RNA sequence: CGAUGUCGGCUCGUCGCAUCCUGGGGCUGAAGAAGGUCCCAAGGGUUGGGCUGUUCGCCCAUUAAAGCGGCACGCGAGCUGGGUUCAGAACGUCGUGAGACAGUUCGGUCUCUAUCCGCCACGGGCGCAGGAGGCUUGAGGGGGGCUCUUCCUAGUACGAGAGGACCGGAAGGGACGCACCUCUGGUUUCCCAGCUGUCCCUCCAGGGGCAUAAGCUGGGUAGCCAUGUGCGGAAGGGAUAACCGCUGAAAGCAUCUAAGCGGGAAGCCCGCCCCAAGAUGAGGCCUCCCACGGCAGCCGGUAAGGACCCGGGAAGACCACCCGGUGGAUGGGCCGGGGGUGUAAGCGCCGCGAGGCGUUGAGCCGACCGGUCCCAAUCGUCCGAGGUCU
RNA sequence: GAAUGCCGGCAUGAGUAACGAUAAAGAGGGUGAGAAUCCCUCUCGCCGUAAGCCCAAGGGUUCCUACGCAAUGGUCGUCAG
RNA sequence: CGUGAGGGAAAGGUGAAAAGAACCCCGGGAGGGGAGUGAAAUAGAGCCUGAAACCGUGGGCUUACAAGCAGUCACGGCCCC
């Protein structure tokens, strides 16, 4: 028996494919389904992704933003059904995989450290050309 | 209850 | 994860600035208060001529924590500081405004008045 | 607990243990056959096999990689030129360990021989 | 009181009703009944189950005879489910439906010779303030001349784990008959690849 | 610590009972299929240098 | 008195019940809710802080409650050493003085090795009248045993009003326990990268040692983990405690009792989980081998089987246990995937240059899920029933 | 037959603690009855205001070579003060 | 041993005579086995006698459901004379 194959088999029902690729440093908007009372609605959470854990169906990523003077980080599962869609708002280039260091940096300092990933931007315009 | 020690502490 | 000795930023305009938890009000021996819990706290730092002054022993509900909180949808949320909002014994906020986002858990736990006053709920 | 951990410690700290493996590789790759204690022998296998399998690759990168462990330009040159080619069609298993029958006198340590395969 | 042998395969989580559900996957079926214990013959009621296909080259002659009396191919593991009497000559995962509630028995991971702090959750000693080589020590183990001895069962260091543990009242989240899979909500004893036993729960 | 110490001399009987496990097991040896000499199994024969039906070593 | 170490703390408990809480009751100056008082009950529970060496006590904030005692005022061959008993020094006081003070003050050497019993763990031996491989019954033990809030019943019964139920039914927490690693969060001694000083290879480029037993830094897989996840306390049956009765004499009435029968607790017995036939009272079922030689016995050759040896293992101090040994995927290589790191070296282009861009998610790459006989588990050896007697 | 007597012998604890700085080792060749420990080579590590060098105390042949290994060397020894 | 004044041991025996064991064997040696000496070699130099504790080998009886200042009294089993 193949234990890995059998696990992957269970997971395949829930595996998601509509979500766009992104990297630590990209600025991203996540449309997340949220329940409040007595309805469910879609709230947007948009910030820099500072982390991507990888583990097959169980990869999760972490988006950080400042909200009304307070820093807020969110952790989403990449295959969570409660994510309506993900919108790349900007490609930024980090030299690292995990960007915990930006938690301690001023807005100016961050802007210098996270320059625009010009390569993956033109590359995004290279697609996005419909036939 | 503090009662007086009956032994000295041992010496080398 | 707020426990006795923890300092909390107050996120209202009661005049308090910094409170220090001295008991987490959640049963006979709660170890930590999280989002939506009430604590008893001493006011360690406050602004002049507020409703509340330095030294007062007030109650407050925790509105955001630096230790991330987990949600049944598999996600979680973490804030840059530990914050609370000072309340009266009827769980109503004592200030007239609240500053910064608050955790959605406040709604479920029946703190509607504070949620409605907050600029953002995450 | 040691659950699912790979790699002996051999009562040496990190750098010493590494040196041990490098120097034994140099020794094995130089004489083709060396004698050691059974534990050191077994551990030596993969350490050298990876080096041999890289000599098979031949590229400059591979030479610069293998050179980090072996250091000796002459030796590495022998590895790529003389050694590697006789393993072209062989896929892994370039070394073998065979346990000797007699123990060491001064400490009763069990001995074995490590060698490059034909 | 139904039951089935199986192997723990590993853990993941799935999504049910906007909720993440920690699950352990168990390869349960198929289990051939190779003996039935009867009150007339054995004095109690149970069904001896077999599990996993076995290389007949490894099965000795005493064992071979047993398997033949049941007309069943050689099997790696024999275990009994008590007070269970399936209609069939083979047990599959079908006997559990999602929503049901089960007990899982497994062999806990072995922590070998374990200290008193891991084994028994002792608090040990201080790490400063004068503490002298007793940081993970038990402290007192007794009194004085009365009683002048140590209690049986006195919590002390020693082996821990590699022992039978049964976790109860676990929700069956799904069952995938085509692959002999069982999805149970939460944590099951033992390592992946370890053998488990899945019985109907005795809770209310 | 307060320097624990034996209370009574160990009897000749009790000493010897402790040593009921101290016996040596003779080495396990099989014949070498080439030269018939006895040797540890799974070891290259130190008498003729043969292992797995072939010469491996000078003896 | 040829030594029984002396307060308090820490640690670890265990018992008592004259019960602090929770469970069950009778009386109440018991409307309800809440109290008072006594009876039954030791199953569990009995918080965090400030002061002081303190035990104790006062105080803060909570709580279902913040119980009182025994165990050499339990516990220093378990720790501490703040108190108190040494030698130093000073204050007050006493003494002409040396000195003294249930007066004060600052300081002041706490001993690696466990023989026996006991306790936690793990084996070796023999036994269990044939020898063996599996699977079990459970005598008897052990573990567990907590509790709160809100909501429905119902703003109902009750009460002038405030206030506010019994019974029955839901949801949600605190602490504790067992297990776990999907998530969250740790560690991850070399898995990747960056960096400084120096020595070296080989001058550049690229690299190696050392700076810790990782030079420093940023990350980080498996595993082991808690702050993270699942589940547990029961349900239920039986017998009772105080207490309440049914029927009923002695005693024409009355009486829970003298005959008999009910109801009745977190407690008791079963039930749940774990250990367990050395349960010498050594149990049971399935299956396998057999009437072997020579003289309930001795020697020897076998059978079914087993051990030795070897490759190993979320098993493990040794041992034991589990898997495998070419009839083979057991470890090591190699390959595929995962995973970490985050775009190698080399070349080309731009800048005077530090550098920058491209090739490029590149190169490197522990344990994870797998594939593959490339390397190694070669070859063998030794034990091992002939079945006592009515 | 006892004086924690005296002198000696031999036990026990026990194949137990320990084998004296955590700067560190690995292979090949040689010698020899015997080699992890002696010789040689290569690789690796440690000291370098020393763990290098030169005096003075103090020690008094320990210096050099040949032949040896019973004891001394905390193991071994073909080596050695 | 102590700077020093000073303190202060242990240790006798082959045989009548060395006749002190040539030679051979195993062993690097030590040691031992034969041979030889002697009245005697468990008189062989680690030498007269050679007690006891202490250690071992072989034999007989006995012991793995048993509670002990270890003996003592009775009976029985086994071994010996
Ligand atoms: Mg997996
Ligand atoms: Mg499959
Ligand atoms: Mg919004
Ligand atoms: Mg931002
Ligand atoms: Mg604020
Ligand atoms: Mg003030
Ligand atoms: Mg283990
Ligand atoms: Mg460890
Ligand atoms: Mg492994
Ligand atoms: Mg390594
Ligand atoms: Mg290992
Ligand atoms: Mg190993
Ligand atoms: Mg070493
Ligand atoms: Mg060692
Ligand atoms: Mg080093
Ligand atoms: Mg280092
Ligand atoms: Mg590898
Ligand atoms: Mg071998
Ligand atoms: Mg030697
Ligand atoms: Mg479903
Ligand atoms: Mg099992
Ligand atoms: Mg401990
Ligand atoms: Mg534990
Ligand atoms: Mg713990
Ligand atoms: Mg503690
Ligand atoms: Mg601690
Ligand atoms: Mg402390
Ligand atoms: Mg101390
Ligand atoms: Mg100390
Ligand atoms: Mg310490
Ligand atoms: Mg202790
Ligand atoms: Mg007693
Ligand atoms: Mg075990
Ligand atoms: Mg001590
Ligand atoms: Mg002590
Ligand atoms: Mg001690
Ligand atoms: Mg000490
Ligand atoms: Mg001692
Ligand atoms: Mg004693
Ligand atoms: Mg003795
Ligand atoms: Mg004896
Ligand atoms: Mg003994
Ligand atoms: Mg051997
Ligand atoms: Mg020869
Ligand atoms: Mg006395
Ligand atoms: Mg004495
Ligand atoms: Mg005495
Ligand atoms: Mg009472
Ligand atoms: Mg009550
Ligand atoms: Mg009560
Ligand atoms: Mg009332
Ligand atoms: Mg009233
Ligand atoms: Mg009452
Ligand atoms: Mg109680
Ligand atoms: Mg009790
Ligand atoms: Mg108590
Ligand atoms: Mg304090
Ligand atoms: Mg007081
Ligand atoms: Mg209260
Ligand atoms: Mg009350
Ligand atoms: Mg208190
Ligand atoms: Mg005391
Ligand atoms: Mg006390
Ligand atoms: Mg002490
Ligand atoms: Mg004390
Ligand atoms: Mg004591
Ligand atoms: Mg004490
Ligand atoms: Mg004591
Ligand atoms: Mg003191
Ligand atoms: Mg003081
Ligand atoms: Mg005092
Ligand atoms: Mg004192
Ligand atoms: Mg004093
Ligand atoms: Mg003074
Ligand atoms: Mg005066
Ligand atoms: Mg006076
Ligand atoms: Mg006086
Ligand atoms: Mg006077
Ligand atoms: Mg005077
Ligand atoms: Mg005094
Ligand atoms: Mg001082
Ligand atoms: Mg001293
Ligand atoms: Mg001492
Ligand atoms: Mg002992
Ligand atoms: Mg046993
Ligand atoms: Mg046994
Ligand atoms: Mg078996
Ligand atoms: Mg029982
Ligand atoms: Mg018993
Ligand atoms: Mg109502
Ligand atoms: Mg009314
Ligand atoms: Mg209710
Ligand atoms: Mg509950
Ligand atoms: Mg994981
Ligand atoms: Mg993790
Ligand atoms: Mg994780
Ligand atoms: Mg993590
Ligand atoms: Mg590396
Ligand atoms: Mg350079
Ligand atoms: Mg460098
Ligand atoms: Mg160097
Ligand atoms: Mg250096
Ligand atoms: Mg160093
Ligand atoms: Mg490094
Ligand atoms: Mg980290
Ligand atoms: Mg690091
Ligand atoms: Mg990890
Ligand atoms: Mg926890
Ligand atoms: Mg009941
Ligand atoms: Mg009843
Ligand atoms: Mg009547
Ligand atoms: Mg009656
Ligand atoms: Mg009744
Ligand atoms: Mg009754
Ligand atoms: Mg009734
Ligand atoms: Mg209960
Ligand atoms: Mg069992
Ligand atoms: Mg039995
Ligand atoms: Mg059994
Ligand atoms: Mg009995
Ligand atoms: Mg039996
Ligand atoms: Mg039976
Ligand atoms: Mg056989
Ligand atoms: Mg092993
Ligand atoms: Mg086997
Ligand atoms: Mg074989
Ligand atoms: Mg084979
Ligand atoms: Mg394999
Ligand atoms: Mg493989
Ligand atoms: Mg990948
Ligand atoms: Mg990747
Ligand atoms: Mg580039
Ligand atoms: Mg490049
Ligand atoms: Mg240029
Ligand atoms: Mg790969
Ligand atoms: Mg092969
Ligand atoms: Mg194949
Ligand atoms: Mg053979
Ligand atoms: Mg006398
Ligand atoms: Mg004496
Ligand atoms: Mg004496
Ligand atoms: Mg004495
Ligand atoms: Mg004497
Ligand atoms: Mg005497
Ligand atoms: Mg003496
Ligand atoms: Mg001992
Ligand atoms: Mg020891
Ligand atoms: Mg040792
Ligand atoms: Mg030492
Ligand atoms: Mg040393
Ligand atoms: Mg060190
Ligand atoms: Mg050599
Ligand atoms: Mg040599
Ligand atoms: Mg040597
Ligand atoms: Mg030697
Ligand atoms: Mg210098
Ligand atoms: Mg001179
Ligand atoms: Mg001298
Ligand atoms: Mg001399
Ligand atoms: Mg000279
Ligand atoms: Mg000389
Ligand atoms: Mg010489
Ligand atoms: Mg010598
Ligand atoms: Mg010698
Ligand atoms: Mg010698
Ligand atoms: Mg010596
Ligand atoms: Mg020596
Ligand atoms: Mg010495
Ligand atoms: Mg010399
Ligand atoms: Mg003197
Ligand atoms: Mg002198
Ligand atoms: Mg004198
Ligand atoms: Mg004398
Ligand atoms: Mg004479
Ligand atoms: Mg004479
Ligand atoms: Mg000779
Ligand atoms: Mg000769
Ligand atoms: Mg020689
Ligand atoms: Mg001689
Ligand atoms: Mg001889
Ligand atoms: Mg002779
Ligand atoms: Mg004659
Ligand atoms: Mg005569
Ligand atoms: Mg004689
Ligand atoms: Mg004589
Ligand atoms: Mg004599
Ligand atoms: Mg004479
Ligand atoms: Mg003699
Ligand atoms: Mg004698
Ligand atoms: Mg004997
Ligand atoms: Mg009995
Ligand atoms: Mg008997
Ligand atoms: Mg008799
Ligand atoms: Zn041979």
Tab-separated table of N, CA and C (backbone and C1' of nucleotides) in Angstrom, chain G residues 30 67 86 124 160 169 175 193 198 203 209 211 263 266 282 286 297 299 309 319 322 338 342 345 347 359 363 370:
chain	number	residue	atom	x	y	z
G	30	A	P	-36.866	31.455	58.890
G	30	A	O5'	-37.593	30.349	58.004
G	30	A	C5'	-38.681	30.675	57.157
G	30	A	C4'	-38.599	29.928	55.851
G	30	A	C3'	-39.825	29.995	54.960
G	30	A	O3'	-39.928	31.216	54.258
G	30	A	C1'	-39.035	27.774	55.040
G	67	G	P	-9.190	27.859	51.798
G	67	G	O5'	-9.785	26.887	52.906
G	67	G	C5'	-10.772	25.923	52.586
G	67	G	C4'	-11.298	25.293	53.839
G	67	G	C3'	-10.243	24.737	54.772
G	67	G	O3'	-9.620	25.748	55.543
G	67	G	C1'	-12.022	23.195	54.558
G	86	C	P	24.825	30.861	64.890
G	86	C	O5'	25.912	29.968	65.643
G	86	C	C5'	26.388	30.301	66.936
G	86	C	C4'	27.846	29.941	67.101
G	86	C	C3'	28.846	30.989	66.654
G	86	C	O3'	29.019	32.034	67.576
G	86	C	C1'	29.517	28.898	65.830
G	124	G	P	14.078	-12.819	28.263
G	124	G	O5'	15.078	-13.566	29.256
G	124	G	C5'	16.444	-13.752	28.920
G	124	G	C4'	17.233	-14.380	30.046
G	124	G	C3'	16.732	-15.714	30.577
G	124	G	O3'	17.079	-16.817	29.768
G	124	G	C1'	17.187	-14.306	32.393
G	160	A	P	-48.897	39.297	48.429
G	160	A	O5'	-48.702	40.411	47.300
G	160	A	C5'	-49.820	41.023	46.669
G	160	A	C4'	-49.584	42.491	46.394
G	160	A	C3'	-48.410	42.828	45.488
G	160	A	O3'	-48.723	42.701	44.112
G	160	A	C1'	-48.354	44.220	47.401
G	169	G	P	-34.564	15.606	30.797
G	169	G	O5'	-34.525	16.776	29.721
G	169	G	C5'	-35.430	16.778	28.631
G	169	G	C4'	-35.250	17.991	27.757
G	169	G	C3'	-33.855	18.230	27.223
G	169	G	O3'	-33.561	17.387	26.127
G	169	G	C1'	-34.804	20.273	27.953
G	175	A	P	-8.126	26.649	31.660
G	175	A	O5'	-7.755	25.508	32.711
G	175	A	C5'	-7.276	25.837	34.005
G	175	A	C4'	-7.667	24.804	35.035
G	175	A	C3'	-7.169	23.390	34.807
G	175	A	O3'	-5.813	23.207	35.158
G	175	A	C1'	-9.438	23.310	35.370
G	193	A	P	23.512	26.902	-0.214
G	193	A	O5'	22.962	28.364	0.092
G	193	A	C5'	22.186	29.060	-0.867
G	193	A	C4'	21.642	30.346	-0.305
G	193	A	C3'	22.675	31.360	0.161
G	193	A	O3'	23.212	32.137	-0.894
G	193	A	C1'	21.061	31.080	1.842
G	198	U	P	41.265	40.551	7.227
G	198	U	O5'	41.875	39.145	7.637
G	198	U	C5'	42.788	39.041	8.714
G	198	U	C4'	42.999	37.606	9.119
G	198	U	C3'	43.704	36.724	8.105
G	198	U	O3'	45.112	36.855	8.182
G	198	U	C1'	41.788	35.617	8.939
G	203	C	P	46.643	31.815	-4.788
G	203	C	O5'	47.020	32.776	-5.991
G	203	C	C5'	47.146	34.172	-5.789
G	203	C	C4'	46.750	34.932	-7.027
G	203	C	C3'	45.259	35.069	-7.273
G	203	C	O3'	44.696	36.140	-6.542
G	203	C	C1'	46.362	34.446	-9.280
G	209	G	P	34.306	23.873	5.775
G	209	G	O5'	35.474	23.997	6.852
G	209	G	C5'	36.484	23.002	6.964
G	209	G	C4'	37.703	23.505	7.705
G	209	G	C3'	37.451	24.218	9.025
G	209	G	O3'	37.263	23.314	10.097
G	209	G	C1'	39.070	25.406	7.741
G	211	A	P	35.563	27.096	15.823
G	211	A	O5'	35.383	28.571	16.383
G	211	A	C5'	36.420	29.238	17.078
G	211	A	C4'	36.372	30.721	16.817
G	211	A	C3'	35.021	31.397	17.002
G	211	A	O3'	34.769	31.725	18.360
G	211	A	C1'	36.076	32.153	15.000
G	263	G	P	-38.589	0.736	44.599
G	263	G	O5'	-38.300	2.282	44.836
G	263	G	C5'	-39.199	3.257	44.345
G	263	G	C4'	-39.121	4.522	45.149
G	263	G	C3'	-37.770	5.200	45.212
G	263	G	O3'	-37.447	5.922	44.045
G	263	G	C1'	-38.732	5.168	47.351
G	266	A	P	-26.261	10.627	42.445
G	266	A	O5'	-24.764	10.990	42.063
G	266	A	C5'	-23.686	10.636	42.916
G	266	A	C4'	-22.446	11.427	42.581
G	266	A	C3'	-21.133	10.870	43.098
G	266	A	O3'	-20.624	9.891	42.221
G	266	A	C1'	-21.235	13.231	43.414
G	282	A	P	-5.007	-24.544	37.857
G	282	A	O5'	-3.779	-23.696	37.312
G	282	A	C5'	-3.976	-22.488	36.599
G	282	A	C4'	-2.677	-21.960	36.049
G	282	A	C3'	-2.027	-22.779	34.948
G	282	A	O3'	-2.618	-22.578	33.678
G	282	A	C1'	-0.398	-22.200	36.541
G	286	C	P	-11.148	-26.970	19.478
G	286	C	O5'	-10.367	-26.160	18.356
G	286	C	C5'	-11.066	-25.333	17.438
G	286	C	C4'	-10.124	-24.662	16.475
G	286	C	C3'	-9.051	-25.551	15.874
G	286	C	O3'	-9.530	-26.333	14.794
G	286	C	C1'	-8.074	-23.535	16.611
G	297	G	P	12.107	-39.644	33.177
G	297	G	O5'	12.796	-40.726	34.129
G	297	G	C5'	13.803	-40.353	35.062
G	297	G	C4'	15.093	-41.103	34.829
G	297	G	C3'	15.970	-40.594	33.692
G	297	G	O3'	16.764	-39.476	34.056
G	297	G	C1'	15.756	-42.941	33.523
G	299	C	P	21.464	-37.647	29.516
G	299	C	O5'	22.206	-38.134	28.191
G	299	C	C5'	23.534	-38.639	28.241
G	299	C	C4'	23.845	-39.526	27.059
G	299	C	C3'	23.470	-38.981	25.688
G	299	C	O3'	24.360	-38.000	25.186
G	299	C	C1'	22.754	-41.215	25.842
G	309	C	P	23.534	-14.035	17.986
G	309	C	O5'	23.946	-14.053	16.451
G	309	C	C5'	25.230	-14.504	16.045
G	309	C	C4'	25.380	-14.464	14.548
G	309	C	C3'	24.930	-13.176	13.880
G	309	C	O3'	25.899	-12.145	13.938
G	309	C	C1'	23.972	-15.006	12.745
G	319	C	P	20.776	-5.610	23.217
G	319	C	O5'	19.854	-6.497	24.149
G	319	C	C5'	20.371	-7.654	24.778
G	319	C	C4'	19.430	-8.156	25.840
G	319	C	C3'	18.066	-8.594	25.348
G	319	C	O3'	18.075	-9.895	24.806
G	319	C	C1'	17.804	-7.219	27.237
G	322	C	P	7.396	-10.375	18.909
G	322	C	O5'	7.290	-9.377	17.677
G	322	C	C5'	6.212	-8.462	17.577
G	322	C	C4'	6.452	-7.450	16.489
G	322	C	C3'	7.017	-7.986	15.186
G	322	C	O3'	6.062	-8.623	14.360
G	322	C	C1'	8.229	-6.078	15.815
G	338	G	P	6.651	17.681	-6.541
G	338	G	O5'	6.539	17.532	-4.959
G	338	G	C5'	5.298	17.251	-4.331
G	338	G	C4'	5.483	16.829	-2.894
G	338	G	C3'	6.003	17.883	-1.936
G	338	G	O3'	5.018	18.819	-1.537
G	338	G	C1'	7.121	15.840	-1.543
G	342	G	P	15.978	32.132	1.884
G	342	G	O5'	15.944	32.031	0.296
G	342	G	C5'	17.142	32.030	-0.476
G	342	G	C4'	16.839	31.999	-1.950
G	342	G	C3'	16.187	33.268	-2.505
G	342	G	O3'	16.554	33.408	-3.872
G	342	G	C1'	14.785	31.452	-2.912
G	345	A	P	26.615	31.946	-8.857
G	345	A	O5'	27.852	31.223	-9.546
G	345	A	C5'	28.786	30.481	-8.782
G	345	A	C4'	29.289	29.294	-9.558
G	345	A	C3'	29.872	29.599	-10.931
G	345	A	O3'	31.232	29.993	-10.870
G	345	A	C1'	28.294	27.864	-11.127
G	347	C	P	32.894	32.360	-17.175
G	347	C	O5'	31.962	32.754	-18.405
G	347	C	C5'	32.147	32.153	-19.676
G	347	C	C4'	30.899	32.233	-20.517
G	347	C	C3'	30.450	33.627	-20.933
G	347	C	O3'	31.176	34.168	-22.023
G	347	C	C1'	28.599	32.433	-20.106
G	359	U	P	15.177	34.631	-17.693
G	359	U	O5'	16.267	33.563	-18.147
G	359	U	C5'	16.313	33.099	-19.483
G	359	U	C4'	17.571	32.316	-19.754
G	359	U	C3'	17.755	31.036	-18.958
G	359	U	O3'	17.028	29.953	-19.512
G	359	U	C1'	19.779	32.275	-18.986
G	363	G	P	18.488	23.476	-12.138
G	363	G	O5'	19.611	23.458	-11.018
G	363	G	C5'	20.960	23.728	-11.346
G	363	G	C4'	21.731	24.174	-10.135
G	363	G	C3'	21.802	23.179	-8.992
G	363	G	O3'	22.810	22.203	-9.175
G	363	G	C1'	21.195	25.294	-8.149
G	370	G	P	4.455	4.776	1.678
G	370	G	O5'	4.544	4.689	0.092
G	370	G	C5'	5.607	4.006	-0.560
G	370	G	C4'	5.707	4.414	-2.011
G	370	G	C3'	6.599	3.551	-2.890
G	370	G	O3'	5.943	2.384	-3.357
G	370	G	C1'	7.122	5.828	-3.236
